[PDB]
Write a protein that binds this ligand. Structure first.
Ligand code: NAP
Ligand code: ZOM
Length: 303
């Protein structure tokens, strides 16, 4: 199903994650995006950064051309990268993403992160970046606009901007049973802003920014117990948890069997006791943890 966003558009509650590290051929994105749409995914998450918008857009166009879906059936997200925060760079970055994907509009365009980089850190008033995003919604380049990796103070900055025209529809953030963001989630619900969870299955544990000593979420013994109780899988428990707390959840997989498994999240539900057990795993663990950004002036986990 879908959640109604605060601008009246609708976002499917399960999303497909398209990021894969540079060792995976670019052409894999094309193949797995078509498999995702075949399995039932209708929300597809990409970004300028992922260097795959050509392949992702071609997958969506291929599934439109063969009659599987209409354009208005797909919710496609792209993201403005942090070297493009200066307001004059926002609409060109979005137009470039549209040309790569060969689409007329995105369903969602996000500020990918608040940590501005030189167009080496940069200092940019993100209120002015937001005004440029608003202009892209008014032009019809993006049906909806949102933010990603913002903390509550950063979100309030936008919500409190003089002459704000559109609130963010969402804040896409790292969110899973080790780092469940309840307080931020509550703040988002109080403003009718959707929290969208990434690394909901514990991240890809990329060696460039994730500590290999960190616990592997899908080997968690409480998730394994719940998967055995429901005869499902640790991944499906982790996804289902987000749906039941009102969080829209992404899931990346480049494996045909796991892509088809992940749509089963709609097939079962967890009890209040199961959900309390998963809530008991919260331990302030974000898998992103690198000197590369941890001392950025707008690092969101500084709090
Ligand atoms: N806004 C941002 O800054 C940001 C940051 C990070 C991620 N994201 C978005 O969120 C998406 C997902 O987050 P993520 O990349 O961190 O990965 P994720 O969804 O947490 O997935 C982690 C690993 O789970 C595996 N997996 C998937 N389904 C499974 C299943 N049913 N059973 C066992 N393992 C399974 C996948 O491996 P296999 O491929 O081998 O199946 C994947 O590499 C990204 O692709 C991107 O679209 C956004
Ligand atoms: C973690 C991560 C994973 C990816 C790839 C993706 O979007 O799939 N991105 C771009 C990041 C960030 O830039 C990021 C850096 C620091 C912080 Cl605090 C939050 C996000």
């Amino acid at each position: 199903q879908c959640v109604k966003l605060n601008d009246g558009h609708f976002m499917p509650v399960l999303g497909f994650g398209t990021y894969a590290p540079p060792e995976v051929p670019r052409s894999k994105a094309l193949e797995v995006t078509k498999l995702a749409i075949e399995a039932g995914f209708r929300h597809i998450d990409s970004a300028h950064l992922y260097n795959n918008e050509e392949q992702v857009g071609l997958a969506i166009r291929s599934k439109i051309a063969d009659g599987s879906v209409k354009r208005e059936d797909i919710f496609y997200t792209s993201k403005l990268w942090s070297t493009f925060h200066r307001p004059e760079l926002v609409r060109p970055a979005l137009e470039n993403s549209l040309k790569k994907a060969q689409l007329d509009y995105v369903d969602l365009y996000l500020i990918h992160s608040p940590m501005s980089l030189k167009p080496i850190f940069d200092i940019v008033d993100l209120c002015t970046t937001w005004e440029a995003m608003e202009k892209c919604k008014d032009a019809g380049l993006a049906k909806s606009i949102g933010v990603s990796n913002f903390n509550r103070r950063q979100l309030e900055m936008i919500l409190n901007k003089p002459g704000l025209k559109y609130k963010p529809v969402c804040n896409q953030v790292e969110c899973h049973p080790y780092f469940n963001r309840s307080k931020l989630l509550d703040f988002c619900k109080s403003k009718d802003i959707v929290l969208v969870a990434y690394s909901a299955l514990g991240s890809q544990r990329d060696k460039r920014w994730v500590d290999p000593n960190s616990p592997v979420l899908l080997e968690d013994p409480v998730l394994c117990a719940l998967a055995k109780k429901h005869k499902r899988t640790p991944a499906l428990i982790a996804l289902r948890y987000q749906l039941q707390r009102g969080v829209v959840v992404l899931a990346k997989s480049y494996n045909e069997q796991r892509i088809r498994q992940n749509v089963q999240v709609f097939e079962f539900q967890l009890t209040a006791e199961d959900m309390k057990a998963i809530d008991g795993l919260d331990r302030n663990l974000h898998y992103f943890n690198s000197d590369s950004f941890a001392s950025h002036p707008n690092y969101p986990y500084s709090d």
